[PDB]
Amino acid sequence: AVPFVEDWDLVQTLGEGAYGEVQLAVNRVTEEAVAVKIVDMKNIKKEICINKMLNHENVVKFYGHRREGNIQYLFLEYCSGGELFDRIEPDIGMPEPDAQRFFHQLMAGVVYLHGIGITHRDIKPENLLLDERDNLKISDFGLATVFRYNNRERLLNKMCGTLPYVAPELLKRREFHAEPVDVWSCGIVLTAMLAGELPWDQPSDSCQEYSDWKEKKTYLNPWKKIDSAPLALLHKILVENPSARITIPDIKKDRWYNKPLKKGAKRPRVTS
Numbered sequence: 001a002v003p004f005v006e007d008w009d010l011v012q013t014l015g016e017g018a019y020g021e022v023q024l025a026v027n028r029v030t031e032e033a034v035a036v037k038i039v040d041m042k043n044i045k046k047e048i049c050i051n052k053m054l055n056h057e058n059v060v061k062f063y064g065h066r067r068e069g070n071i072q073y074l075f076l077e078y079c080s081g082g083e084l085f086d087r088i089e090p091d092i093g094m095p096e097p098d099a100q101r102f103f104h105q106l107m108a109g110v111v112y113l114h115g116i117g118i119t120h121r122d123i124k125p126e127n128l129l130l131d132e133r134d135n136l137k138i139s140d141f142g143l144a145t146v147f148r149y150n151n152r153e154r155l156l157n158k159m160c161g162t163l164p165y166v167a168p169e170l171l172k173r174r175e176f177h178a179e180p181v182d183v184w185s186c187g188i189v190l191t192a193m194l195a196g197e198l199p200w201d202q203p204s205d206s207c208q209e210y211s212d213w214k215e216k217k218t219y220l221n222p223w224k225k226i227d228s229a230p231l232a233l234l235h236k237i238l239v240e241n242p243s244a245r246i247t248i249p250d251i252k253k254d255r256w257y258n259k260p261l262k263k264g265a266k267r268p269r270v271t272s
């Protein structure tokens, strides 16, 4: 019953796009920050529906929405760290330990989503945000859909995603399982974090870069910059046949995935 507590000031645009804009909003009274997605209306109702069933530390939180005419307002968790995209150095990537930690968190979020029958369908660095403690959070469920309901799996057929990150079966088959597709895009994200470049414009035999990969020419630019341990994992994720592709439970058993590399975030320290 505190006056003004429901007032939010839009401080700045966090990002724009065909679906509208996302702005940083600060509470007039508490100064708490949240991200407000503004949709001009003229998918959205489905996005809200999907967001309402999400609750995980590696998934951007949904606080609520307000119709107010033809402009939908989505109140979402503000991730002060920005996009994972900006943590990747062009043609370099990032330190392996950091990439491993981010990959661990990405897997946690994906395991959660798949557990409740939801597939993201557009996993990429631009959609992976970081909070104040660099914790990764999966965002933007505008392309997400239910692939399992009442314990029955529904095969997908809709062409969704972003070419460099899309699995080859989405371009070669009429129908396909949802989960291996998200696993594949996570592998491309791992490649990007470790090499600072995408392997191919798209996973097609017509694409020379892709053909080279299937021929195991790992001495080529992308893969040459990646250590043997994480590369062995990528060899299991970027497998053309989705039925032979490694699943998440098995990714969790992979040698590199479990290799001690990253230390704590530090905080104390004083001698004598």
Ligand SMILES: OCc1n[nH]nc1-c1ccc2c(-c3cc4cc(CN5CCCCC5)ccc4[nH]3)n[nH]c2c1
Binding pocket: 012, 013, 014, 015, 022, 035, 037, 060, 076, 077, 078, 079, 080, 081, 082, 083, 129, 138, 139, 140, 141
């Ligand atoms: O699932 C949630 C969702 N669905 N759709 N959109 C989202 C969605 C999109 C973006 C964000 C963000 C966010 C974007 C962002 C960008 C920067 C970079 N900075 C911005 C100001 C100018 C200088 C550069 C820094 C921190 C940021 N935090 N937080 N929460 C979001 C939710």
